[PDB]
Amino acid sequence: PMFIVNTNVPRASVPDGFLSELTQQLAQATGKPPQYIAVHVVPDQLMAFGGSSEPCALCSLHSIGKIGGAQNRSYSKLLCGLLAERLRISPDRVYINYYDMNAANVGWNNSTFA
Amino acid sequence: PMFIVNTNVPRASVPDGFLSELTQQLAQATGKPPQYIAVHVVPDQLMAFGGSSEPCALCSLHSIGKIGGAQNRSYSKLLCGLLAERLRISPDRVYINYYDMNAANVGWNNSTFALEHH
Amino acid sequence: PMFIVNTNVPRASVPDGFLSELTQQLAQATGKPPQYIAVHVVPDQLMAFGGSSEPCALCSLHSIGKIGGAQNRSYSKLLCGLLAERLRISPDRVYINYYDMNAANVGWNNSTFALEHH
């Protein structure tokens, strides 16, 4: 799986341990091994949410399976919680796009997961 | 909805008011409340379009519904128009990927927009 | 088509000509004219793959058609080979998301690639 978070919060406000916490908690939540979890954090972005430049985040989580109604609500509670606690971003200023990827549509190690 | 624009145009060339104009015009175009419109502009990128590095933009618009044949052509006219007028990017050097998101696949405020079944 | 590469490799490590090489190789692989191939490389990113910050890349390839089981295996061998050769990134630290776009969902030049119906 891969998780990306784009935010206008400054890089200095990202705490030590963040990428590792995201990796471990997403491994727990998705049921996938941590060695297959990739994370990308993009601070200092020029963005607005509702026309306001208060802290916000636009994110995405891609996974082959383990994407659905209840699961996505669980991922959103987990991720909004981390973004609130660690980056001080209000949950109502976060959007997370979820993608259930077909294994044939994910390349890795010179081939695909199909 | 969320609209992202990635471009090689310098940050200095983005005019004051641009994020607000995109927010307001997308609210008008999609019929969605402006309070729910998010925008992200990424300048100074290393990109090429057709192998040339003249000004260009690669964008995306994600919305739960309001994505379709005629609507997407209307959004493209609006957005290419704004990118040409404000960032001086030629419309034929702009790609915009449209995504019709299912409500269950959009997280917000500790949950998603699928609040009907559990 | 559009190909995006996000990596933690430093900008100085992206060779001159890399965008052009990707453009040419992708035009060849997809059969699409190079004039329609867009590439975006984003170095110096804060990323981890499997909990490690050694070189890695998260990428995407969007194309209207020319996306499928065998074609994607071929694109992966091609692209991982280029990322390994040019950016020194191990293929097992590379993910590439493939998207088969509908023509009506790709905006370009004030409209979309759905020009047949109203």
B49 to chain A, minimum CA–CA distance in Å?
23
Q: Maximum CA pair distance of chain C?
A: 50
Contact C52, A23 (CB under 8 A): no
CATH code for the structural domain at C1-118: 3.30.429.10
Supply B48's token pair.
Answer: 């090429």
Helical (H) or strand (E) element with A111: strand A111-112
Instruction: Check if A67 contacts C (Cβ < 8 Å).
Output: no
Residues 6+ apart with CB under 8 A from B6: B42, B45, B47, B57, B58, B59, C40
**Best residue in C77, C85, C95 for a mutation probing chain A (most A CBs within 10 Å):** C95
Q: Where are chain C's structural domains? A: 1-118
Chains interfacing with B (3 or more CB pairs < 8 Å): A, C
Query: What's the CA gap between B86 and B83, in Å, rounded?
Result: 5
Residues of B in contact with C10 (CB under 8 A): none
Residues of A in contact with B12 (CB under 8 A): none
Instruction: Check if B41 contacts A (Cβ < 8 Å).
Output: yes
Residue C5's region, left for phi above 0, alpha for psi from -120 to 50, else beta, is beta
Q: β-strand C2-7 against C38-42: which pairing, if any?
A: parallel
Q: Is A50's CB within 8 Å of B39's CB? A: no
Q: Is B48's CB within 8 Å of C20's CB? A: yes
Number of neighbours of residue B49 by Cβ within 10 angstroms: 27
| Nearest alpha-carbon partner for C55 in C4, C5, C8, C6 | C8
A54 to chain C, minimum CA–CA distance in Å?
22
To the question of whether residue C97 is assigned a binding role by annotation, the answer is yes
| Nearest alpha-carbon partner for B40 in B25, B55, B18 | B18
Instruction: Check if C12 contacts B (Cβ < 8 Å).
Output: no
Supply C61's token pair.
Answer: 């390839």
* Residues making up chain A, counted from first to last: 114
Q: Is C96's CB within 8 Å of A110's CB? A: no
Residues of C in contact with A36 (CB under 8 A): 50
Domain at A1-114, CATH homologous superfamily = Macrophage Migration Inhibitory Factor (3.30.429.10)
Q: Is C94's CB within 8 Å of A109's CB? A: yes
| Nearest alpha-carbon partner for C30 in C69, C58, C72 | C72
Number of neighbours of residue C50 by Cβ within 10 angstroms: 17
DSSP 3-state of C6: strand
Query: What's the CA gap between B77 and C110, in Å, rounded?
Result: 4
Burial class (CB in 10 A: 0-12, 13-18, 19+), B87: buried
**Chain B: residue whose CA lies nearest to A91:** B109
Instruction: Check if A75 contacts B (Cβ < 8 Å).
Output: yes
DSSP A11-72: GGGSPTTHHHHHHHHHHHHH---GGG-EEEEE-S-EEEETTB-SS-EEEEEEESS--SHHHH
A76 to chain C, minimum CA–CA distance in Å?
21
**Best residue in B58, B59, B71, B82 for a mutation probing chain C (most C CBs within 10 Å):** B58
